């Protein structure tokens, strides 16, 4: 099974990747991107009018929408609605769904403090009373004068914590209230698996496409691939004793004398004698103790001759030869 693999790739370090990535995402398709941004700007009065009807507005589409939501929520809408009702403008409570550390307790503790504490609602705070406390919020809000006092934003609604099911139903009861406007965005292709006709009854979602093919700068940070071990032990050797460099150099030679697999490895006895030959290893214990340091940071393997072999590729070890060992 001769497969080309990501290990057999010309790799790129940390500062080299992120800088040339920053060059593309700020200079690749710049002119048509704001050219799209001016086209969709005329839809902004249409969103203002429908949002008076308490409609949970939901934005789908390819690409990141994070920049677009923050322009649309903060600068455009939130002072426009305060001027049209008649003083600080309408409070914006974003929810970063790409941040996995969102819970149901903490954000709702913000909500009841963002909303009015007209009564002693801490008396009803008791043991899951969250649905209980919001139910007492809802029926009171059915008989209030209709005006928006809060707009909340939920970025990346299919996020790693917001897509949890006890959190989803929590947002469902918020959306039936007329005083708050719910402007959220998702990115998943299976996002309408999240809602049944029970929740969408509470939601009354409407949909709009926004596809600007954004790079998702902030949304790439928490995500990881093998760019983010061959690269792990690449830094430990840069800070050690000078003898460990030499005893790894003698290790890496005869382990690449023969991918870097088990079969190219060496026996412990002769390697003790080999590192006794260059006046390096005194005995087995002095060898093994500064070999456990290569073991503790998982920089070498052993299987069974008593074969110690390096788990990095054929291409990687000669890169480890000519750069850091030399």
């Amino acid at each position: 099974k001769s497969r080309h693999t990501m290990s057999m790739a010309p790799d790129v370090t940390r500062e080299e990747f992120s800088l040339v990535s920053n060059f593309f995402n700020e200079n690749f398709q710049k002119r048509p991107r704001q050219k799209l941004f001016e086209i969709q700007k005329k839809m902004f009065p249409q969103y203002w009018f429908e949002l008076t009807q308490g409609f949970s507005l939901l934005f789908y589409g390819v690409g990141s929408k994070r920049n677009f939501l923050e322009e649309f929520a903060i600068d455009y809408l939130s002072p426009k609605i305060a001027y049209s009702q008649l003083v600080n403008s309408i409070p914006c409570l974003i929810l970063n769904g790409y941040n996995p550390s969102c819970n149901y307790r903490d954000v709702f503790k913000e909500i009841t403090d963002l909303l009015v504490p007209a009564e002693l609602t801490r008396s009803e705070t008791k043991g899951n009373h969250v649905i209980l406390q919001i139910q007492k919020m809802i029926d009171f809000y059915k008989n209030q004068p209709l005006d928006i006092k809060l707009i909340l934003v939920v970025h990346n609604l299919d996020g790693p914590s917001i897509r949890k099911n006890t959190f989803q139903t929590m947002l469902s009861f918020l959306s039936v209230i007329r005083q708050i406007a719910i402007v959220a965005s998702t990115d998943h292709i299976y996002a309408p698996l999240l809602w049944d006709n029970m929740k969408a009854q509470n939601y009354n979602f409407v949909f709009h496409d926004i596809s600007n093919f954004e790079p998702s700068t902030v949304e790439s940070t928490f995500q990881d691939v093998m760019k983010m071990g061959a690269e792990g032990a690449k830094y430990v050797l840069q800070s050690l004793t000078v003898n460990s460099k030499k005893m790894y150099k003698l290790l890496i030679e005869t382990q690449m004398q023969n991918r870097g697999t088990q079969r190219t490895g060496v026996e412990l006895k002769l390697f003790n004698h080999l590192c006794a030959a260059d006046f390096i290893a005194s005995n087995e214990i002095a060898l093994r103790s500064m070999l456990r340091e290569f073991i503790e940071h998982k920089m070498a393997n052993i299987t069974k001759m008593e074969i110690i072999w390096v788990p990095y590729t054929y291409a990687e070890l000669e890169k480890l030869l000519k750069t850091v060992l030399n």
Binding site: D158, R163, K164, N165, L193, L194, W195, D196, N197, M198
Partner: protein, 422 residues
Amino acid sequence: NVTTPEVAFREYQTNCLASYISADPDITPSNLILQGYSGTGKTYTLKKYFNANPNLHAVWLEPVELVSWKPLLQAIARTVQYKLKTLYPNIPTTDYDPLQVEEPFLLVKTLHNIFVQYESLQEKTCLFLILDGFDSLQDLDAALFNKYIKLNELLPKDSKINIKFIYTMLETSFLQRYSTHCIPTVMFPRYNVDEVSTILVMSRCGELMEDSCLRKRIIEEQITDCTDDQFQNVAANFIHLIVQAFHSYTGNDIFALNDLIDFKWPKYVSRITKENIFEPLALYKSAIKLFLSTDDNLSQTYDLSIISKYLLIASYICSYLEPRYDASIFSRKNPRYLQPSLFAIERLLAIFQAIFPSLMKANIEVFQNLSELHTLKLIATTMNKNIDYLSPKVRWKVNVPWEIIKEISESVHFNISDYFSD
């Protein structure tokens, strides 16, 4: 020496319980096992002893109305000082908190505190504790039952009042774990077909001759002055037939007979005549219809919509259709008994797009009815019910039997039995 009662079918077992229980503590063995399944009247035959013995004192506890051992200790310690108040009201007491105990040390800590002020009594009096239903405690384990055996020996043995136990449990696989302790057991056998009917007639004559549903039907029909014995006969003719037309359905139960009587009784009452009171055999021939049906079940055409109906009919396909065969037989160019296999996502829409009447492309409402079907628990997740949205490794599966699929196939005129081929 004790005053034994007498009951219907416990003639051996009344003797042993009179044997293994005396008011004297020295003759009284410490721990005891009353074993038998539900449907033997052990709670009946135990209390029936105790009403005939007013000399002893019984404290009745009920584990089935508790949930755990931590209240069960609180159940014991609250009651003995409750009982000993009502047995020796002259004795002064530093009443302790039964809420305070939560650990098995704390009981014998508190029973060391309780019994010492009661030391001034005149003779060694015993005190029988009764636990009813020790196997159906809902947090039981291996190391709880032995934990209650040795409680007697941690007590001081020379106290004037001695606490001893009687354990009621069932599921005799459980008792086989503890036969090496060799505590004295009195097993209670199950019943036979006659003695089920014999128990049932002497226990249900007191209600079924005195029910107003009879008493209405007395004055509603032309009432001949039929005797209570004439009421006794038709009651006995009812019981001796209802156990005969149903014994294979119910086994040797008593509880399952005590309610099936109270379902078929007024429906039996309406089909009597003025004349069939003297005519019992023809009365059964006129009231026949209830004696061959169970009448315990209080087949739905399902509420869900059309696109959701085809959403169900594609989900049943992967109870037998493997990925090796399906794409060949469903081109756009038997495990009916067995447990269903595991889905993944988009294999549904792989089959759903094929079997739908290019005529459809919008899949927003199709995605709507999935989690609608998830709330109906007709298709459920293999894993926990939380992260199933974002496509991590999540496998799906149906939970509907074949018949409800078969009606719902013809309810949308779709044919399914062709594609199931052994």
